[PDB]
Structure 1
């Protein structure tokens, strides 16, 4: 369906918190279900000049997988530098 103040204390005390500040049941605070007509933006390439596809495409700029050795002293190298150990949290250390 607003609870009587008598049990407002009961639900608040029995759970040790203020339920009425924030409830699971929604109320008039929700956004209106009817909204004004929106005007959506255009993309960065919606330019009527200097928008040639040859300087804008992404698919035709992928090369075949580069070959580095085929079966047809040098320092040891890792695939990537080893990760740096994560630091402990600042907002909330050990729970």
Structure 2
């Protein structure tokens, strides 16, 4: 931090980068370990009214697999529309 000036320029030169701007050891930027009491929020449905489980009962909303064909003019169709070709990233087009 730590190190002295002439050492910094030595490793700055050998790496071709400014390591003093950002390093890989935390010195003072670390958040304080003890923190104020974290008052948490409440649920979106936390309300004393109109929140019966008759409305939100997702486990109940599920329907057994809808059967269409059973052992006991027309047009061809696809399982999904064909995918589209992604373009080059305009940020870095060529590495």
Settle same-fold status: TM greater than 0.5: yes
Count of aligned positions: 95
What secondary structure is seen at the aligned counterpart in 1 of 2:69? Answer: coil
Scaled by the length of structure 1, the TM-score of the pair is: 0.96
- For residue 84 of structure 1, report the CA deviation from its aligned partner: 0.8
Determine which structure has greater relative contact order: mean sequence separation of CA pairs < 8 Å that are 6+ residues apart, divided by chain length.
2
What secondary structure is seen at the aligned counterpart in 1 of 2:6? Answer: helix
- For residue 87 of structure 1, report the CA deviation from its aligned partner: 1.3
Q: Which runs of 5+ in 1 are unaligned?
A: none
Scaled by the length of structure 2, the TM-score of the pair is: 0.96
Map Cα deviations across residues 3-24 of structure 1 (whole Å, 9 max, x no partner): 1111110000000010000000
Moved over 2 A (4+): none
Cα separation, 1, equivalents of 2:50 and 2:27:
51
Q: Which runs of 5+ in 2 are unaligned?
A: none
Greater strand fraction, Structure 1 or Structure 2: 2
What secondary structure is seen at the aligned counterpart in 2 of 1:86? Answer: coil
- Give the CA RMSD over aligned residues: 1.1
Cα separation, 2, equivalents of 1:4 and 1:45:
58
- For residue 73 of structure 1, report the CA deviation from its aligned partner: 3.0
Map Cα deviations across residues 51-86 of structure 1 (whole Å, 9 max, x no partner): 010011110000000001001131110100000111
